[PDB]
């Protein structure tokens, strides 16, 4: 099974809590995180893009770096880990994404890929006057279909004459083309989203589910595998979990409870047994060996090819993962 790190490009990472570690996302922190992940043979690092926050006491995701320039800087200080940036497709023309991807292909020596998202959060786009309207919910995947067709032409041949409802290319040129076949990843959960991924993505990100119910997402991965049969392409699922690990199960549970006890309800109001403290994320809470075991269970779910991990504390969570959890995982014996 592959393991990636979801890098905190947003302040406080994925915990919405006065008792959680408090930190701004800086280049240097993301650098320390990704270089530590790489030291422990993490397979990839991904940042999201988040153009508007949720406020409250912790000003949750009010402070966010931009994904392509962050990952270009991280590519320059790494040498093995795969690097993925997220394009919010409403905000960047496809030929710019195509040339940015070529550029980070160059920085990284072929280690770069792109996570394509339609955008769902209307205010992220409305705030800058670029929301298409409420037709967009229904048409997101049509737009994204034309978008990726333009990227495919440009990465494949260096040119595109594509013409659709949303784009008009007139002998559009992008060169250099990527040194390696450019990976596209998607995080579709809907039927349309999974059918998008089945056609154009290398893999699909889905949400892990429950607290300490590691195989609860299985039906989502089942649907994604069914979507992939429709195109004959091999598009596995990567599953997002938060790991809250410690020396014993009791100690990890005490941390989790402590985090939930500091919940920042004001920030939580703007947004809207799993907790909203981490956006109801799939959470694995346990001793190092309990977490290793639960992650081994994820690896056995049909369709599951990797996990994307957040931590309560990235610097020491990556360290304990690599020192205490990973060496116990069957799916990492390679
Ligand atoms: C791992 C992961 C990363 C995501 N990153 C982003 C992001 O950077 N920006 C964003 O607007 N949405 C992001 N999303 C939300 C999805 O792109 C998506 O809209 C949502 O999962 C619902 O699926 P649908 O688009 O099929 O309705 C992410 C989802 C997952 C699972
Ligand atoms: O659930 C989520 N995790 C990270 C980013 C976004 S937008 N949503």
UniProtKB/Swiss-Prot annotation:
NADP as UniProt keyword: yes
Entry keywords, A to Z: Flavoprotein, FMN, Monooxygenase, NADP, Oxidoreductase
Effect of loss of the gene: Cells lacking this gene lose the ability to utilize pyrimidine nucleosides and bases as the sole source of nitrogen at room temperature.
GO molecular function: alkanesulfonate monooxygenase activity; monooxygenase activity; uracil oxygenase activity
Catalytic activity: uracil + FMNH2 + NADH + O2 = (Z)-3-ureidoacrylate + FMN + NAD(+) + H2O + H(+); thymine + FMNH2 + NADH + O2 = (Z)-2-methylureidoacrylate + FMN + NAD(+) + H2O + H(+)
Protein task: The FMN-N(5)-oxide reacts spontaneously with NADH to produce FMN. Requires the flavin reductase RutF to regenerate FMN in vivo. RutF can be substituted by Fre in vitro.
Leftover remarks: The Rut pathway degrades exogenous pyrimidines as the sole nitrogen source at room temperature but not at 37 degrees Celsius, a restriction that is apparently a consequence of an inadequate ability to remove toxic malonic semialdehyde at the higher temperature (RutE/YdfG function).
EC number: 1.14.99.46
GO biological process: alkanesulfonate catabolic process; nitrogen utilization; pyrimidine nucleobase catabolic process; thymine catabolic process; uracil catabolic process
Family, per entry: Belongs to the NtaA/SnaA/DszA monooxygenase family. RutA subfamily.
Protein name (record): Pyrimidine monooxygenase RutA
Induction section of the entry: Up-regulated by the nitrogen regulatory protein C (NtrC also called GlnG) and repressed by RutR.
Keyword Flavoprotein: yes
Gene name as annotated: rutA
Residues that coordinate or bind FMN: 49-50, 115, 124, 140-141, 190
